[PDB]
Scaffold this active site. Sequence first.
Site, PDB file in Angstrom:
ATOM      1  N   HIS A  40      28.620 -13.510  23.335  1.00 48.94           N
ATOM      2  CA  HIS A  40      27.218 -13.762  23.658  1.00 48.94           C
ATOM      3  C   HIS A  40      26.942 -15.248  23.862  1.00 48.94           C
ATOM      4  CE1 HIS A  40      26.529 -14.746  19.297  1.00 48.94           C
ATOM      5  NE2 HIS A  40      25.636 -15.555  19.837  1.00 48.94           N
ATOM      6  N   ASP A  89      31.250  -8.248  20.425  1.00 48.41           N
ATOM      7  CA  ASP A  89      30.868  -9.636  20.647  1.00 48.41           C
ATOM      8  C   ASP A  89      32.033 -10.582  20.376  1.00 48.41           C
ATOM      9  OD1 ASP A  89      29.422 -11.893  21.191  1.00 48.41           O
ATOM     10  OD2 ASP A  89      28.214 -11.836  19.358  1.00 48.41           O
ATOM     11  N   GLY A 189      23.317 -21.267  15.834  1.00 52.07           N
ATOM     12  CA  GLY A 189      24.194 -22.386  16.117  1.00 52.07           C
ATOM     13  C   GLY A 189      25.543 -22.298  15.428  1.00 52.07           C
ATOM     14  N   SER A 191      27.190 -19.323  15.827  1.00 47.73           N
ATOM     15  CA  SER A 191      27.812 -18.267  16.626  1.00 47.73           C
ATOM     16  C   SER A 191      29.184 -18.659  17.164  1.00 47.73           C
ATOM     17  CB  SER A 191      26.899 -17.878  17.792  1.00 47.73           C
ATOM     18  OG  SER A 191      25.766 -17.160  17.335  1.00 47.73           O
TER      19      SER A 191
END
Lengths: 243, 9
Positions: A40, A89, A189, A191
Site C-alpha cells: 500500500h 499487503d 509512517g 508502514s
Amino acid sequence: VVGGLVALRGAHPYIAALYWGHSFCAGSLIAPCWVLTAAHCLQDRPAPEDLTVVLGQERRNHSCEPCQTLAVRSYRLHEAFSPVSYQHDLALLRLQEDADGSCALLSPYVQPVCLPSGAARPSETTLCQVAGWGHQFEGAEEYASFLQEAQVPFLSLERCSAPDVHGSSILPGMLCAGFLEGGTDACQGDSGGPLVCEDQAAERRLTLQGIISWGSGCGDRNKPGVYTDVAYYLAWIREHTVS
Amino acid sequence: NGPLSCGQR
C-alpha cells in the site's frame, strides 16, 4: 512508533528506508538484493527510477557514515493486493546492483533479516519488536527523526478477529501484535517496516514475521496494529525472490 | 567466523 524508545545504532541492520518524491516508507532487507515492504506504500505505482533505498540509516533523511544509498531496479506488488482491505499487503523491491554485481554492501549496520519458519505454531506467548520512524502519537505533527523501537506481544487471530477488537476486518495473510490494553503500537509512517519476533526454533532466534500494514489510532486500547503475515507468503516470496 | 545460519536449531 508509540510507547517505544530510541534504537541503538547496531540494533536494526535489516531495516530499509524508502524515499521517493514527497513520500516515505520503511522496509526490510531479506536478502542482499531484496527489500520487503508494504504494497500500500506503492499503490500509487511510482516509477522505480524515482525510488531511493537507504540502508544502515539511523536518523530519517539524514546522511550518515555507514549509510548506503541504492537505486531500485524493479518492484512487484502482490497480485491480489487490495487498496481497500489491505489484504496481501506486501511488495518486493529489487535493488540495483553496481558494476561489481553487488547490491547491499553488508556490514555490522547493514545485514539481511532471517525469513520466518512458518511451520511453527505461534502462541500469544511470542514476543516481538516493532520499529519505525513514524508518529510517536496519533496527534503527532512530524515523523520521528531517530528510529523508534518497541516490544510487543504477538496476538492470535481468533482473539484478533474478535468483535471487540478488529472483528471481521482481519483476513487471511494478516496477523496482529500489541497489547489490548494499548499503549504500544505501530503508527502512521511506520508502514512497510519490520516486525521481528522470537523464534526459539531458529538458530538466530529472531525472524521477520510481520510487515507493518494498518490499524486504528496509535496505541488505542483493544486496537492492536495489523501486520502482513510474512510466513503466509513464504512461497510467494521464494517464487519472486528467486527471479 | 563466517555467516550464521538462519535455519532452525
